[PDB]
Amino acid sequence: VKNQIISQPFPSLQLSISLCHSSNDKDHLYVLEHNLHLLIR
Amino acid sequence: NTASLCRIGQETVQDIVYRTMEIFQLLRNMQLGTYQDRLTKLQDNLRQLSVLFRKLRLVYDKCNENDPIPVEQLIPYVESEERREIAEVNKKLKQKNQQLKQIMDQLRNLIWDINAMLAMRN
Amino acid sequence: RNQQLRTLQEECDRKLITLRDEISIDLYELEEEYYSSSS
Amino acid sequence: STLVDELESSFEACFASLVSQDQEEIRTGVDQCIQKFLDIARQTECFFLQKRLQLSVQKPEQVIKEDVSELRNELQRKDALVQKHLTKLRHWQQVLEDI
């Protein structure tokens, strides 16, 4: 929609990806977030 | 105190067998500096085997005198405070085991995370 | 600047690897100790 | 009656051909000596199990005492090992904090 990605790998697995920012305001897996930067670099 | 003696005698029987096998293996390993070292090791093993035989004899002599009821009679076919005290140790031990489970699953998650993060640092 | 940054990175990597090995050893001992009890 | 005596008799007979004052004879001798030794050991095993079963079915109190002893001992084992893990954990925590 705007800042979320929603996905269904398995019929009982929902993962969500979200960009969070602070010029835009009016339980997590650290490994995947760390790996994301290395993929893009 | 007597069942423990029977278990000890059994265990000493297995150690006697194992020591005999180890003696034969050590005699096999001898090939004509270190020869005196092997000889001293052989003497030590033989003397501790003799001590083990003496201990087995002592256990057998102690347990022989202390059968009124024969075997094949107590097999069940188709046709007081000790319990109270035991339970607490079981529950306490079970509780301790449960606690160890929490630490173990936590440490394994930590090692999984470090493996996953370190695998792709290149 | 490049040389200094690479040296710092190498030190951090070494520390993490040694920590992982130590934790694995203990982790191995803990499983064995726990998995062989009558509960 | 005194099975241990012929136990060591067979044990010493296993060494008979060595301490004395071309392969078939020694192989046969060691075969019979070794099979006799194993048989005597298994018979002693059987006697201990029969006695243990009789004692356990007659009075379980001694069995209970042994159970108490083993459970206490393993309790101390667990406590000591978890203490060792904590000490090393503090050590590496400070080592990694020195960065």
Describe this entry's structure for a reader.
The structure is cut from a larger assembly and holds chains A (41 residues), B (122 residues), C (39 residues) and D (99 residues). Helix content of chain A is 27%, strand content 20%. Chain A has 41 residues and is an alpha+beta fold. The longest helix of chain A has 11 residues, at 30-40. Chain A starts with a strand and ends with a helix. Chain B contains 3 helices and no strands. Chain B starts with a helix and ends with a helix. With 39 residues, chain C is an all-alpha fold. Helix content of chain C is 85%, strand content 0%. Chain C is built from 1 helix and no strands. The longest helix of chain D has 37 residues, at 61-97. Chain D is flat. Chain D has 3 helices and no strands. The B-D interface holds B 1-4, 6-7, 9-10, 13, 16-17, 20, 53, 56-57, 60, 63, 67, 69, 71, 74, 82, 85-86, 89-90, 92-93, 96, 100, 103 and D 4, 8, 11, 14, 37, 41, 44-45, 48-58, 61-68, 71-72, 74-75, 78, 82. Chain C: Residues 1-22 form a coiled coil. Chain C: Belongs to the Mediator complex subunit 22 family.
Gist of the model:
Chain C: Residues 1-22 form a coiled coil. This is part of a larger assembly, with chains A (41 residues), B (122 residues), C (39 residues) and D (99 residues). Chain B is mainly alpha-helical and 122 residues long.
**Broad structural category of chain C:** mainly alpha
Give the biggest sheet of chain C.
Answer: none
* Main pleated sheet of chain B: none
Please write the string of helix (H) and strand (E) elements of chain C.
H
What is Rg of chain C?
A: 18 Å
The total count of helices of chain B amounts to: 3
Q: What oligomeric state best describes the polypeptide chains here?
A: part of a larger assembly
Greatest interface by residues involved: B-D, 31 and 33 residues
Number of helices of chain C: 1
How large is the share of residues in beta strands of chain C? under 5%
Helix/strand order of chain B, N-terminal first = HHH
Task: List key phrases describing it.
part of a larger assembly, 4 chains, A: 41 residues, alpha+beta, two-stranded antiparallel ribbon, extended, B: 122 residues, mainly alpha, 3 helices, 0% strand, transcription, Mediator., Mediator of RNA polymerase II transcription subunit 17
Question: Layout of SSEs?
Answer:
The structure is cut from a larger assembly and holds chains A (41 residues), B (122 residues), C (39 residues) and D (99 residues).
Chain A lengths: L3 E4 L7 E4 L11 H11 L1
Antiparallel strand pairs in A: 1-2
Chain B lengths: L1 H28 L5 H31 L15 H39 L3
Helix pairs in contact in B: 1-2
Chain C lengths: L1 H33 L5
